[PDB]
């Protein structure tokens, strides 16, 4: 889930 | 408890529109002039690969939005995931109030709803998109209030789907804030808030018009979708 590396 | 001593809480409203104003992704220019004319499949690549490089400045903005990296990383990418198309929405109807009966998706980038008709059931949302444009063109919507209302739809469209509650009424309250200074009466501040409130559950309605459109086009194959815009619409299935 890239959103949730993009995020952090 | 999440959020509970946020800085988000304790800003004066002129401390909030600042932090909003600050957080403001660029305006991106299409990487490609389109030729004329438009197929189904050169239209919907030009949206894709726009809303896809808007999508990361996204996340940049998210991140300066007070309220939203005091949220869990999970929490984060449910708003994310349930927000991008009524903030990719929002932001080009804001963009496009200076061009009546047109959607400015990019300075190089310019459609009429004629346009719109070179990919099947596009026309009805550019309608939708060029209605909701022209509402906040009578309305006189101000820079401020847009980044009021851009942060609202982030917190609020995923929230049923009490930290974020806090957060909201702190932007209701710069909202109210920015029409008393502007010297409406409190009788037009409460009418404004709600005919502003009242255009999210549009722009919600366009972004799931849009959403099945977007299923309907990754079906067809018609353009290749990045893996970031895949993961978005399979959290909508």
């Given at each position: 889930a ?7 | ?6 800085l ?7 401390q909030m ?7 403001e992704?660029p305006?991106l220019?299409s990487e490609?002039?389109p030729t004329?004319?438009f197929s189904?499949?050169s ?8 809303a896809?490089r808007?999508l ?5 903005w ?5 309220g939203?990296?005091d949220?869990?990383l999970?929490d984060?990418?449910?708003l994310?995931?349930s ?5 990719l929405m929002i932001?080009?109807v804001?963009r496009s109030?200076?061009h009546?009966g047109?959607?400015?998706?990019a300075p ?6 004629n346009?719109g008709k070179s990919v099947?059931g596009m026309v ?8 909701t444009?022209?509402?906040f063109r ?7 209030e847009?980044?009021?209302?851009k ?6 469209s995923?929230?049923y789907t009490?930290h974020i509650?806090?957060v909201?009424d ?8 920015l029409?008393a200074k502007?010297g409406l009466?409190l009788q ?8 502003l409130?009242?255009i999210?559950?549009?722009?919600r ?5 849009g959403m ?10 018609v353009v290749p979708?990045?893996?970031?815009l ?5 959290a909508?299935?």
């Open positions: 890239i959103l949730h590396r993009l995020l952090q | 408890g999440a959020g509970a001593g946020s988000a809480l304790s800003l004066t409203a002129d529109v600042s932090a909003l104003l600050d957080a992704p305006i220019y490609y002039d004329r004319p189904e499949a239209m919907m690549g030009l949206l894709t690969n726009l896809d808007e990361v400045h996204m996340i940049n998210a991140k300066r939005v007070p939203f990296v949220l869990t999970h984060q990418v449910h994310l995931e927000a991008w198309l009524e903030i932001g080009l804001w109030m200076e009546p047109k959607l400015l998706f190089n980038l310019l459609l009429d709803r346009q099947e009805e949302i550019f309608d939708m998109l060029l209605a444009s022209s509402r009578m309305m006189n919507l101000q820079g401020e847009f980044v009021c209302l942060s609202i739809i982030l917190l609020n995923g929230v009490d509650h806090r909201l702190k932007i209701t309250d710069t909202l109210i804030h029409m502007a009466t037009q501040q409460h009418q404004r808030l709600a005919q409130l009242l999210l559950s549009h722009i309605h366009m972004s799931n018009k099945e459109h977007l299923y309907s086009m990754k079906c067809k194959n979708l990045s893996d970031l895949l993961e978005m619409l399979d909508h299935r």
